[PDB]
Amino acid sequence: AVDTAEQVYISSLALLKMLKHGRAGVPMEVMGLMLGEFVDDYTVRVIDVFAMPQSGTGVSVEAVDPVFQAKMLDMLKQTGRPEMVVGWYHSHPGFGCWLSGVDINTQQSFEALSERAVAVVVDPIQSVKGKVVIDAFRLINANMMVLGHEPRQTTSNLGHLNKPSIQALIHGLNRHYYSITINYRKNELEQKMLLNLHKKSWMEGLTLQDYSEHCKHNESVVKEMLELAKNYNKAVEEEDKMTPEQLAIKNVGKQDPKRHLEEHVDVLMTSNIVQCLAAMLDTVVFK
Amino acid sequence: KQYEKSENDLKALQSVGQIVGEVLKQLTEEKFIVKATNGPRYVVGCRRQL
Amino acid sequence: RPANHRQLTFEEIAKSAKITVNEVELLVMKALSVGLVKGSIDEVDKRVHMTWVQPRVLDLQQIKGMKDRLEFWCTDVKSMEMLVEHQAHDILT
Amino acid sequence: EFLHAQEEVKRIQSIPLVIGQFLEAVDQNTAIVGSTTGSNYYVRILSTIDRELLKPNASVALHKHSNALV
Amino acid sequence: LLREELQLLQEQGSYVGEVVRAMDKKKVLVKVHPEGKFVVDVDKNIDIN
Amino acid sequence: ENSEKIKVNKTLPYLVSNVIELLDVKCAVIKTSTRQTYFLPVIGLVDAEKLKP
Amino acid sequence: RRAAVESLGFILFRTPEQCPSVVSLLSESYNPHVRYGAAMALGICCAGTGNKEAINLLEPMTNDPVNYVRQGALIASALIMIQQTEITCPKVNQFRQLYSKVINDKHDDVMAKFGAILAQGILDAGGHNVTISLQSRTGHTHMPSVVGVLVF
Amino acid sequence: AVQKVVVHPLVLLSVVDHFNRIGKVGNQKRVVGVLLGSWQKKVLDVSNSFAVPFDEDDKDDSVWFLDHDYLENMYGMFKKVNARERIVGWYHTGPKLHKNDIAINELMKRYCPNSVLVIIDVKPKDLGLPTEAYISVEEVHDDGTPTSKTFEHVTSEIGAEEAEEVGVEHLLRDIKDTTVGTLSQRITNQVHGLKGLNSKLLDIRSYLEKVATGKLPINHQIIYQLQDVFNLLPDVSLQEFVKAFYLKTNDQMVVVYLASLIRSVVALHNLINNKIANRDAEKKEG
Amino acid sequence: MVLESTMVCVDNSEYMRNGDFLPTRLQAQQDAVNIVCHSKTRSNPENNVGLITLANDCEVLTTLTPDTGRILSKLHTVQPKGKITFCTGIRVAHLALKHRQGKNHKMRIIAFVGSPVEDNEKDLVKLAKRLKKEKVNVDIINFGEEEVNTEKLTAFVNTLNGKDGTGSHLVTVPPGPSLADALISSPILAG
Ligand SMILES: [Zn+2]
């Protein structure tokens, strides 16, 4: 229909609430509401996420208890920030994350309250480490198919939408759905203290403790895996000396003949762990 | 009470049939390997309260 | 005695405690039975080895020795750590 | 770039895995497996698999839609 | 870029089939694995010979 | 209620099947004519008296 | 990253022999964004010059499986041939066939062939009577030229 | 008792956003909230958390507020959505703990039997490990104190979960120098010396400070006790601690001969492959 | 339906443990809480009532709630033994009503004083100027005994709302064993 620039802001707590609540109830689509602030025409800013309670034991079925609305928003009024609801979410846990018939069913009833209340889909399965996968959508009408649907200001967002993407059925659901870009702004305070946590708190408390424990390893436990290393670096070696012989025998470097390889580099890296933690001994133990 | 029992039926019309199978063995803490009785094998997961 | 070369022989025990030779073993094993010493005994020289001392109330000279030896340890740890850090800093980068 | 690309490859398994059996391999990065759906397929493989772990006959994880060695 | 070519694995699969004998008009006859037979086409790269 | 049972019962192809057993943890187990075993926790529009394996 | 490699021509348009030699390894980068800004950098630096190395580098830039890097290739291939006819480059009709080839195709996207109609606007602009130049006789750089194409 | 508590990133970000909640009133307000978790084992688990109303004024500075009813109904909400999840304790911002930081636990001991607290820092000037956690026990003294009811720290870290791995490890994208091997530990090797130094600097500052102020604070029990513990274990003796160094030679031995033998052979073999494919393509190219 | 949030302050001080009032002082002030909670409920159902004490600690037994069921529960087994506490009683009630949500509702408090207090006059006049700078009206309903012809409360209410205050009162205790309805019969009319 009449479109605008497509842009969705986040909160950093949001994504975590999404993944936790969509993981803890995984095989059934778990309803959840979404809370934020309509700043303007084209950007929407979710700032808070609270999950919905569950009901009877069936896929995709959803409800909005209004006493839960009143009491939850009341608690968030006596919490420091009360703000306006901005939409909702659930998961499509086993697939390529398209809104189902029940999803568009609650969308045509939910769209009469808010215009740009954006439906969002988290998936805790098709993301491993380098995917969110954040996936939000927006419903189109059927009355305005006499008119066009195609102003699409700031053209980059659409061409960006077609790349994160697959299916025959998403391709069948470019009707009734046009997505919207999601991006991420991060507090440098929060970024730096998450860096504190996950580049400092993977090192452990007082920080001497586990390195002196490695120093405990280096004179009691290492010699056993050094015996394992020496037995490997005899047994693997007397047959990997057959390998340049057979390289001279068969061809100049053709296809893979069979199972084994050199594999020594990994065992040598474990020996490098041995020497570095043996270097730790002088440093820690003395002074 | 007709409306009550038939509304229970009305809510109940949305349940989904579920596949019956047997578990071959356990791979990991979350990965499970089953066999559908009609046919092929699979690799599945559990719920969180099982 | 400042807890470094402190392996005590029979003589100073039998001089302080003013008890005879074959009673100092009872004297030390009584404290070993109680646990207000955590050492051991050789008897070719009757050297009773000391790996223990009692925590005692901090006096003024104990205050000063505390701060001085604590700083003595601290500046040595710092001065060696700075050399480790600077020597292998640019390979961290 | 390379390590994050390696782990972005790793979204493939995650919970819909079906079990074929290894039958043959054409060459490097190309194999032949026959599923427990009776039929038999010419599939591609991931660069993740250590190639010692295969080629007698191994129960192997396949993708559902793409039906490739994983 | 080769690792970023991973959208190739995500596409589809391919069949292995047994040839009985070819015929005219650049076609063959294939009995795939459990099913019957199919008169199918060749690609550009392979020889009918 | 009649609208929903119109939306279900006007689906005129009825896959026929056979009730294998009847759990109670009110739960029926089905083998269809395609020989695919199905579980269902919710029985539907028949009564547990009229059912037998 | 896009604007960072777009800065190259806007700081080094005084000499055009430099930028192909230094962006000849950026043209085949990992993401479409550095490739895109690289293509536009070769477009803005070799604009008023009949370069052959720029056409050399921009030749396989229309083939990448991302749409808008092909679009930027179309815009840059319009920029390389301002009022150029048949002696500065043999690629005049070789690209006039190309823009019509991609716009009269149906299955290509809108973002792909937006640059095609835009480049046909560029190649025939002013009835070939006016052209673009960041340079005058006086050595001074022409300011609304730089500002207009920069905001463009 | 408790082995250790396992804090997840979600609750820490749920403190940061809470400071962002109450950062607009500004005037005089610490961050205080309520902790949620799971008593897994002797180890402790933490999953969720949320807010609480709380304030504290200047005159008669023992004025503190814990809404029971907020706790009742919002714990009813969280128990309604998740029955695996229940209360384990509370938290606050923790610059340090002040004197009034016992009464919160002494309120909500009637909810959790061992109501554990969490002390964090929203300002990451701490070059130590954040998310400190105490627990209140009693240690009734030889001096005949009636009941000393003192919080005592049980160690803490940041744990892992599969989905929060996806979350955190995508939210970073910032820094990765590790290439995990001989050098993923050396940054933390600078850290262990430097963060023994910071703690020891706190030690010497405390030792100098007790003599000046506190009127005679000096710790009176745990100064002489743990000081003599310090003065009973710096072993610098030289009889066989010198003779650990042929075991150090043995530590050197294995890695020296593994490196010297196999590293050169592998690199040589790769030189063989490179020069074969170099000259045999050179005779076909030129 | 006038806008406030009536903060009742119960009197579980140790001098309330006798029976100089009608059965027990606790029961008469409990029925006083009943009539003021229904009176402010019929005055407005929007406004809400929590309770607070002047015991060993001024404990928030009830959060500010419109329903009186928890009030009915907490008026029993109140442990009426302990030293009176007033000066920080103002502070705890004030910050309890700065823990409200609708701050257009008046910070109306009622205080039940039935014991000799040890307040300083300068402390309560800092409270007087404080509550002048805090927009609070408190009608104090005295009980039991004090320094008789009760002192510092005349001073506190007089220093509270000078120069057109007209919102804070002082209901002194009648030192006669009278019915509790006769004690609330003038406060049920107005302040
Ligand atoms: Zn869905």
Swiss-Prot record, chain D:
Record's subcellular location: Cytoplasm; Nucleus
Superkingdom to which the source organism belongs: Eukaryota
SUBUNIT field: Component of the 19S proteasome regulatory particle complex. The 26S proteasome consists of a 20S core particle (CP) and two 19S regulatory subunits (RP). The regulatory particle is made of a lid composed of 9 subunits, a base containing 6 ATPases including PSMC4 and few additional components. Interacts with NR1I3. Interacts with PAAF1. Interacts with TRIM5. Interacts with ZFAND1.
Function summary: Component of the 26S proteasome, a multiprotein complex involved in the ATP-dependent degradation of ubiquitinated proteins. This complex plays a key role in the maintenance of protein homeostasis by removing misfolded or damaged proteins, which could impair cellular functions, and by removing proteins whose functions are no longer required. Therefore, the proteasome participates in numerous cellular processes, including cell cycle progression, apoptosis, or DNA damage repair.
Family: Belongs to the AAA ATPase family.
Protein name: 26S proteasome regulatory subunit 6B
Protein source organism: Homo sapiens
Lineage, uppermost ranks: Eukaryota, Metazoa, Chordata, Craniata, Vertebrata
Range of the intact protein held here: 71 to 140 of 418
Swiss-Prot record, chain E:
The protein, known as: 26S proteasome regulatory subunit 8
Assembly: Component of the 19S proteasome regulatory particle complex. The 26S proteasome consists of a 20S core particle (CP) and two 19S regulatory subunits (RP). The regulatory particle is made of a lid composed of 9 subunits, a base containing 6 ATPases including PSMC5 and few additional components. Component of a complex with USP49 and RUVBL1. Interacts with PRPF19. Interacts with TRIM5. Interacts with NDC80. Interacts with PAAF1. Interacts, in vitro, with the thyroid hormone receptor (in a thyroid hormone T3-dependent manner) and with retinoid X receptor (RXR). Interacts with ERCC6.
Species name: Homo sapiens (Human)
Intracellular or extracellular location(s): Cytoplasm; Nucleus
Free-text function comment from the UniProt entry: Component of the 26S proteasome, a multiprotein complex involved in the ATP-dependent degradation of ubiquitinated proteins. This complex plays a key role in the maintenance of protein homeostasis by removing misfolded or damaged proteins, which could impair cellular functions, and by removing proteins whose functions are no longer required. Therefore, the proteasome participates in numerous cellular processes, including cell cycle progression, apoptosis, or DNA damage repair.
Location of this fragment in the whole protein: 58 to 106 of 406
Record family assignment: Belongs to the AAA ATPase family.
Lineage of producing organism: Eukaryota, Metazoa, Chordata, Craniata, Vertebrata
UniProtKB/Swiss-Prot annotation, chain G:
Location of N6-acetyllysine modifications: 106
PC repeat feature ranges: 3-35, 37-71, 72-112, 115-147
Source organism superkingdom: Eukaryota
Family: Belongs to the proteasome subunit S1 family.
Assembly and binders: Component of the 19S proteasome regulatory particle complex. The 26S proteasome consists of a 20S core particle (CP) and two 19S regulatory subunits (RP). The regulatory particle is made of a lid composed of 9 subunits, a base containing 6 ATPases and few additional components including PSMD1. Interacts with ADRM1. Interacts with ZFAND1.
Function: Component of the 26S proteasome, a multiprotein complex involved in the ATP-dependent degradation of ubiquitinated proteins. This complex plays a key role in the maintenance of protein homeostasis by removing misfolded or damaged proteins, which could impair cellular functions, and by removing proteins whose functions are no longer required. Therefore, the proteasome participates in numerous cellular processes, including cell cycle progression, apoptosis, or DNA damage repair.
Protein name listed in UniProt: 26S proteasome non-ATPase regulatory subunit 1
Gene designation: PSMD1
Curated annotation (Swiss-Prot), chain I:
Keyword Nucleus: no
Biological-process GO terms, alphabetical: proteasome-mediated ubiquitin-dependent protein catabolic process
Gene Ontology MF terms: identical protein binding; molecular adaptor activity; polyubiquitin modification-dependent protein binding; RNA binding
Family membership noted in the UniProt record: Belongs to the proteasome subunit S5A family.
Function: Component of the 26S proteasome, a multiprotein complex involved in the ATP-dependent degradation of ubiquitinated proteins. This complex plays a key role in the maintenance of protein homeostasis by removing misfolded or damaged proteins, which could impair cellular functions, and by removing proteins whose functions are no longer required. Therefore, the proteasome participates in numerous cellular processes, including cell cycle progression, apoptosis, or DNA damage repair.
Complex and partners: Component of the 19S proteasome regulatory particle complex. The 26S proteasome consists of a 20S core particle (CP) and two 19S regulatory subunits (RP). The regulatory particle is made of a lid composed of 9 subunits, a base containing 6 ATPases and few additional components including PSMD4. Interacts with NUB1. Interacts with SQSTM1. Interacts with UBQLN4. Interacts with UBE3A. Interacts with UBQLN1 (via ubiquitin-like domain). Interacts with DDI2.
Protein name according to UniProt: 26S proteasome non-ATPase regulatory subunit 4
Species the sequence originates in: Homo sapiens
Interval of the full protein contained in this chain: 1 to 191 of 377
